């Protein structure tokens, strides 16, 4: 976008704090549980029948961690998420045709997980910059 230094360092701050092994699985699982239509894209990832089974799923969990590494890559590229995401965009929009509303919805899920995890570190200012960030990511995906 047109980042201030404070936003850059808040955003890098959030992803320096997060353990992606914990956050990733939680956020993706939660996406699949709260918005089950997104299960459609994960037919190859084995067992998605109940919630308890979603959380127990190692393939879903690892994929949640890859989504965070994806995000982290966008934090390495804050001024060119578009370019940095081109192949991810070909993949989500040209190949899989995920409706843009879905990127929004997993973004939201992720913000809910990050909020639960960070507690008092999740200030208003922190969320403002985090959302600005996700809004660039979803535009880059679509």
């Amino acid at each position: 976008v047109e980042w201030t230094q404070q936003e850059r360092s808040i955003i890098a701050g959030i992803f320096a704090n997060l353990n992606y092994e914990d956050i990733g699985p939680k956020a993706l699982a939660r996406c699949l549980i709260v918005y089950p239509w997104t299960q459609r894209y994960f037919g190859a990832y084995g067992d998605l029948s109940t919630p308890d089974a979603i959380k127990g799923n190692a393939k879903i969990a690892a994929h949640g961690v890859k989504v965070l590494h994806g995000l982290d890559r966008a934090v390495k590229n804050m001024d060119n998420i578009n370019e940095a995401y081109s192949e991810l965009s070909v993949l989500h929009s040209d190949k899989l045709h995920v409706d843009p509303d879905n990127f929004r919805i997993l973004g939201d899920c992720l913000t809910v997980v990050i909020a639960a995890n960070l507690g008092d570190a999740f200030t208003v200012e922190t969320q403002c910059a985090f959302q600005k960030f996700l809004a660039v990511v979803v535009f880059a995906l679509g």
Partner: protein, 143 residues
């Protein structure tokens, strides 16, 4: 959007743990919607001050979670139960229906922030359903 017996039970169980923080939740949620989604501020433009934790954000936040408290009371028919709140938001104020999802989202973030242990995926699906129902029922008086 129809809420199951499981959804209502989940929402009411969650409300039983959280409701003593209702004022703080409303305040923290309104505050964030206005700062994080500044376009919602055009509705609050006559207010002196719209900033996180300010006097008006706190006073209004209480009201707003009083409205959620009201919906938990009316959960079997939100359509009628929030009729007056619809009149005000949809018919008088002409709040763009896209902003209800924003405030819903902000409330879930603050509940998750405040009660991370209580706010499981299971609480999350049912609270998100309930909030959508709240959002639909508030949209009743547009048209």
């Amino acid at each position: 959007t129809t809420l199951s017996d499981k959804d209502k039970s989940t929402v009411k169980a969650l409300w039983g743990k959280i409701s003593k923080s209702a004022d703080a939740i409303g305040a923290d949620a309104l505050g964030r919607m206005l700062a994080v989604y500044p376009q919602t501020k055009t509705y609050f433009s006559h207010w002196p001050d719209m900033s996180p934790g300010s006097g008006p954000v706190k006073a209004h936040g209480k009201k707003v979670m009083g409205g959620v408290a009201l919906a938990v009371s009316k959960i079997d028919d939100l359509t009628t139960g929030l009729g007056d709140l619809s009149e005000l938001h949809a018919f008088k104020m002409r709040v763009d229906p896209s902003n209800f999802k924003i405030l819903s989202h902000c409330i879930l973030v603050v509940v998750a922030k405040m009660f991370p242990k209580e706010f499981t995926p299971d609480a999350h699906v049912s609270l998100d359903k309930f909030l959508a129902s709240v959002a639909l029922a508030l949209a009743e008086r547009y048209r």
